[PDB]
Structure 1
Amino acid sequence: GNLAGIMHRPDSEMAYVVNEQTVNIRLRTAKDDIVSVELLAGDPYSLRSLPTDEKFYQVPKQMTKIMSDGISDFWQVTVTEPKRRLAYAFLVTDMLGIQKIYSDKGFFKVADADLMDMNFYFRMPFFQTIDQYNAPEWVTDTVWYQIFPERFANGDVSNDPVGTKPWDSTDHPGREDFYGGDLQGILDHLDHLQELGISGIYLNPIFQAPSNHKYDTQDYMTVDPHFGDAKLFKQLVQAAHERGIRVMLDAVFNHIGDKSVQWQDVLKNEQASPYADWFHIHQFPATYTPTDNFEFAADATYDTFDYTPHMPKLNTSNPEVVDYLLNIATYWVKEFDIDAWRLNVANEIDHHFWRKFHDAMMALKPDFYILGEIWHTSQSWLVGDEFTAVMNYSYTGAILQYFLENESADALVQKMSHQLMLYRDATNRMMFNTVDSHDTPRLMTLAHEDKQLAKSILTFTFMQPGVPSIYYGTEYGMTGENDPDDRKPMVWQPELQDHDLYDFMQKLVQVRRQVIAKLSDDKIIFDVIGERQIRLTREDNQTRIVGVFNNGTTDLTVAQPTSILLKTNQSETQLAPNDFMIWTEPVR
């Protein structure tokens, strides 16, 4: 009995409200150390207040071992209680047959447990739906497409910045290059987006900013003049909505650009500036020593994003900053009807501000989607009062490491199970899955131009619980290393486009939207069936979707499925190295 490996944290992802009378409860144990876990649960007041001789601890509820991360096992159970008050404890039995009760009071023999004392148990005191996590349903049926607007399509040469280069997808872009992409180009290629089958557009920042990336905001209340104007953006949003495509914008609230009005005021008036307290200035005047790298300063007298002097950090604890940012976030939603906000460097802004932001957005749109850009563990931002989800960088990163390196299938399945057990079930369905972006090398480059490997990575990711996204140009096999090489002008020429990959992407998106998205309360199972061989199963009460991935150096034979949805090998039974097959079957 590895008692040190057993843990339950109440009022957490291990004990949360699903609906008015229902809760989900989890227990962590040491891997393969516990053979069974039962839950003793009921109304805490029923023990001594009800005249009945029956007590809730006399009818245990069996828990199911749902996941394992190589170190711990994870058990779960769902409990319904009409009184909406729950006290609970765990009955754990290990390999040697040693059984103990685990409660808020610790570990006991069942004979020594004070089961009649309501304060012996862990507690969910009252099922508070106002405190619970809620997931917007529409996100479940979405496949996103990420657009870096400067490089997607130039629909208007008239607004091009000075020195705009000729549109060349084969170019290796420089850090300060401009190609002239704008909102009119996105409006022009909405038909390509709809033919691909995507139902959501994620835009990198489009607010006035001097750079090609626009993360150094100059004015949050105005669309960049090179990109277009307010009327054109409203037209774009309405056309997207007409095509059944939702819109998500990028909010850069952790820092502002140095060319912004507030910062220039700070540079002119120093401490006498009204915006001095909008920033984190250690010493006046706000200064820094320039270096050869434009994005690096070693001795700035003010806090900044990374070590770049051009992005002074905003003081989100200042009430004036709070009001300003909330007004911006409310303005874009209320005036242009956007569907989601993507929060840049969301982890470096305080929870207090995010709580206010969540309240404002939900007061505007109850089904709003708040996505946080965080690379590490975000349990504190996904309780239900702040973000809906975060970018699932660790999940897709583990997937990429498995497919590109020679790691065992067990390692990948353990990493994915750890990730899933970090959060609530619905939160897991809201996580944002992308294999590359404007900050990482392109998938085709990562796969060393191995198309089959890229198809396998994309299919494996699209089968995951989170919502998938396609970085612009992935559907045509665009290559590139890290930024700025991952921001090449979009390949609009047919001679340079991979049409086979585009056809495959259309089929993959169709499988995601017509099959995996229509599963009802599906369960996910990871099975390691051999060295670098994985069987993924998503299963609801009526239908089951199975995908087998052969990433070994040998052929793999499977029983012939009756209805194959997607496969790369011509055979219906044999899988060569890097092949995969997806099929569907009724539950029996």
Structure 2
Amino acid sequence: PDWLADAVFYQIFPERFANADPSLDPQNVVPWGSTPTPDNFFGGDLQGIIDHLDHIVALGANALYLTPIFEADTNHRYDAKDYFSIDHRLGTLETFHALMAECRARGIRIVLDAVLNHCGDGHWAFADVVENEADSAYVNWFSVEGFPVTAHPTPNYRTCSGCYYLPKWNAYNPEVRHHHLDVARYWIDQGIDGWRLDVPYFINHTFWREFRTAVKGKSEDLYIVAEEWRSPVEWLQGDTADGTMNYTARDLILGFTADGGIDASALAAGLNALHAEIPAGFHRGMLNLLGSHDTERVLTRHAGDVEAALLSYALLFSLEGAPMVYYGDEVGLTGDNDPGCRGAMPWNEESWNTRLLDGIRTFAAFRAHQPAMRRGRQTAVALDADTIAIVRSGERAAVIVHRGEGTTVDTASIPELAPLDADTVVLGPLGTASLAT
């Protein structure tokens, strides 16, 4: 769906964004500046989201990707216990409605996280099966080996990666399919713009063909994007998704800007190869990123070197497909991989790194003002071991990205750069240039 050419995403983990309504907080909520764990709650909430929408817009984003928000027992909310309600700590459906209306009044589209492979050990249907066993009307909605159901010391029922508090949904049951496909419809009826697929590789392609057809039938332009850490090609045959989370680009970029493992020749060859692997009409549905809730933080991956991290963002905003910033990374937050990357969002602007923030907005502005940067063909061209041009044509546009101590670039002599004008371009240490027309 074409609108993805002009999209810029901000991923939010709602428990850690903003505690607007401390009446919703649990009894043993912790302080906002606390160290995040797998078990503690900071009381982030949906009103916190409405109240800080202006920061999102100011950064340059016009789409949100939200991690789970339905009723659940954990702080991450991948153990859903009622798919038809907002978690009681997040807000009510009225709070949710109020968030949607403010979003549509700014041109901000919403994506929620579809967790259909599994649910929580506290869900009504799993908790009944535990209680009514083979007499339960929901016995077959899961894959339970025998009775009594036992989790410790090993679950006697199918689960997501062997985790006991996540029992596995039986998708071969038409009843389970019905419920599942009603989730996708119920939230589409509430003003949703699309769905991200939690671990879609743990189910089957026939299911996800069913899911596209129920989704695209509410509207063609609803967007489906698959979680996938490896090759995207399975998901882009035109029968499942519109794109994937582009972890392949993530590893190529950080390899070059942070690790030092890959030089620019290696970067471009991989980016062109990936472009050749991806099928026509699907390049611009790709969801591009440098980190998420399942990774260490960008600045931490960069060892605190802020200018180096700005090279990451420059390459991020140049690529064909839609770029996503993870909450806090724009303002300089640090942190190791989960739970460390699910720190609380600081709101006293004096603690922010505003130069990193303003760096990122500059790259957003250039892309937004340049059509070719949104709908151009992508060609990566290496200039140097330490210097690469990402060229976009619809009339070229091009971002050049230097990780060295300084350089000069001869436009007129690079055939894909030649159709631009200004002969030589000058790049400072860890420099970047953005050119057009």
Match runs of 1:408-557 below 5 Å: 408-516=263-371, 520=375, 522-540=376-394, 543-552=395-404, 554-557=405-408
Unaligned runs of 5+ in 2: 413-423
CA distance, structure 1, for counterparts of residue 134 and residue 430 of structure 2: 62
State the AA in 2 paired with 1:156. D
CA distance, structure 2, for counterparts of residue 423 and residue 453 of structure 1: 29
Q: Residue 397 of structure 1: which of 230, 245, 251 is its match?
A: 251
Q: Do the aligned partners of 1:447 and 1:454 also contact (CA within 8 Å) in 2?
A: yes
Name the residue aligned to 1:357.
211
Unaligned runs of 5+ in 1: 1-135, 291-298, 562-571
Using the TM superposition, give the Cα deviation of residue 483 of structure 1 relative to its aligned residue in structure 2, in angstroms: 0.6
Deviations 1:371-429 (A, max 9, x none): 11111223222211221111111111121112212222222222222222222132111
CA distance, structure 1, for counterparts of residue 230 and residue 134 of structure 2: 36
Match runs of 1:128-277 below 5 Å: 136-168=1-33, 171-277=34-140
Q: Do the aligned partners of 1:223 and 1:229 also contact (CA within 8 Å) in 2?
A: yes
Q: Do the aligned partners of 2:283 and 2:320 also contact (CA within 8 Å) in 1?
A: yes
Relative contact order (alpha carbons < 8 A, sep ≥ 6): 1 or 2 greater? 2
TM-score normalised by L of structure 1: 0.70
Tell me which protein shows more strand as a share of its residues: 1
Secondary structure at 1:495's aligned position in 2?
Answer: coil
State the AA in 2 paired with 1:440. T
Structure 1 consecutive aligned stretches of length 4 or more whose deviation exceeds 3 Å: 516-520
State the AA in 2 paired with 1:331. Y
Q: Do the aligned partners of 1:317 and 1:350 also contact (CA within 8 Å) in 2?
A: no
Secondary structure at 1:494's aligned position in 2?
Answer: coil
The alignment status of 1:578 with 2:433, answered yes or no, reads: no
Secondary structure at 1:211's aligned position in 2?
Answer: coil
State the AA in 1 paired with 2:118. H
Using the TM superposition, give the Cα deviation of residue 517 of structure 1 relative to its aligned residue in structure 2, in angstroms: 5.9
Name the residue aligned to 1:282.
145
Secondary structure at 1:306's aligned position in 2?
Answer: helix
Using the TM superposition, give the Cα deviation of residue 518 of structure 1 relative to its aligned residue in structure 2, in angstroms: 6.0
State the AA in 2 paired with 1:483. D
The percent identity for this pair of structures is: 37
Tell me which protein shows more helix as a share of its residues: 2
Using the TM superposition, give the Cα deviation of residue 150 of structure 1 relative to its aligned residue in structure 2, in angstroms: 0.3
CA distance, structure 1, for counterparts of residue 215 and residue 96 of structure 2: 20
* Paired residue total: 425
CA distance, structure 2, for counterparts of residue 269 and residue 314 of structure 1: 18
CA distance, structure 2, for counterparts of residue 177 and residue 556 of structure 1: 49
Q: Do the aligned partners of 2:286 and 2:322 also contact (CA within 8 Å) in 1?
A: yes
Using the TM superposition, give the Cα deviation of residue 528 of structure 1 relative to its aligned residue in structure 2, in angstroms: 1.6
Q: Residue 238 of structure 2: which of 377, 380, 384 is its match?
A: 384
Secondary structure at 1:338's aligned position in 2?
Answer: coil
166 and 242 in structure 1: CA distance in 2 versus 1, 3 angstrom threshold:
same
State the AA in 2 paired with 1:141. D
CA distance, structure 2, for counterparts of residue 422 and residue 162 of structure 1: 51
State the AA in 1 paired with 2:250. T
CA distance, structure 2, for counterparts of residue 478 and residue 484 of structure 1: 14
Name the residue aligned to 2:420.
none
Larger Rg, first or second structure (1 or 2): 1
The alignment status of 1:338 with 2:338, answered yes or no, reads: no
CA distance, structure 2, for counterparts of residue 397 and residue 280 of structure 1: 36
CA distance, structure 2, for counterparts of residue 308 and residue 516 of structure 1: 46
State the AA in 1 paired with 2:225. L
Using the TM superposition, give the Cα deviation of residue 288 of structure 1 relative to its aligned residue in structure 2, in angstroms: 2.5
State the AA in 2 paired with 1:323. H
Q: Do the aligned partners of 1:140 and 1:517 also contact (CA within 8 Å) in 2?
A: no
Name the residue aligned to 1:84.
none
Name the Cα RMSD after superposition.
1.7
Deviations 1:261-281 (A, max 9, x none): 111112112233222211122
State the AA in 2 paired with 1:556. T
